[PDB]
């Protein structure tokens, strides 16, 4: 939802990727400010229709902006989860849903 204050600790609930609730990796923050990990990117919106899987944005000149000058990842907020969960980041490095609505 909002800013973080200066030096505070994020909870693990907004480090999630809201897409496959794995610790974020590699944060990729779409030009209307949602988030996901970048596998979650590859997956669901480089690689399927290129828009935002949470509001449907248009992302595909942001994609290819970006992929072009690879920028894709918000190194600020990749910088912040690897600080404070350092542990997560190094576990995902190493490897019930009544609405099914997001595709692949
Ligand atoms: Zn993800
Ligand atoms: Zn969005």
Same mark, same amino acid.
């Given at each position: 939802?909002?800013? @973080?204050? =200066? ?15 794995? +610790? @974020?990796?590699?944060?990729?923050? &779409?030009?209307? #400010?949602?988030?996901? *990990? ?8 480089? %690689?399927?229709? @290129? *828009? *935002?899987?949470?509001?449907?944005? $248009? ?5 290819? !902006?970006?992929? /072009? $000058? #690879? ?9 912040? +989860?690897? =600080?404070? !969960?350092?542990?997560?980041? %190094?576990? $995902?490095?190493?490897? !019930?849903?009544?609405? /099914? @609505? &997001?595709?692949?």
């Amino acid at each position: 939802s909002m800013a @973080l204050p =200066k030096d505070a600790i994020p909870s693990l609930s907004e480090c999630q990727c809201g897409i496959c609730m794995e +610790i @974020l990796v590699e944060p990729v923050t &779409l030009p209307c #400010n949602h988030t996901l *990990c970048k596998p979650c990117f590859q997956s669901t919106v480089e %690689k399927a229709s @290129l *828009c *935002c899987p949470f509001c449907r944005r $248009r992302v595909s000149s942001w994609t290819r !902006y970006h992929t /072009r $000058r #690879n920028s894709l990842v918000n190194v600020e907020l990749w910088t912040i +989860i690897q =600080k404070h !969960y350092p542990r997560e980041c %190094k576990l $995902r490095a190493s490897g !019930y849903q009544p609405v /099914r @609505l &997001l595709s692949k």
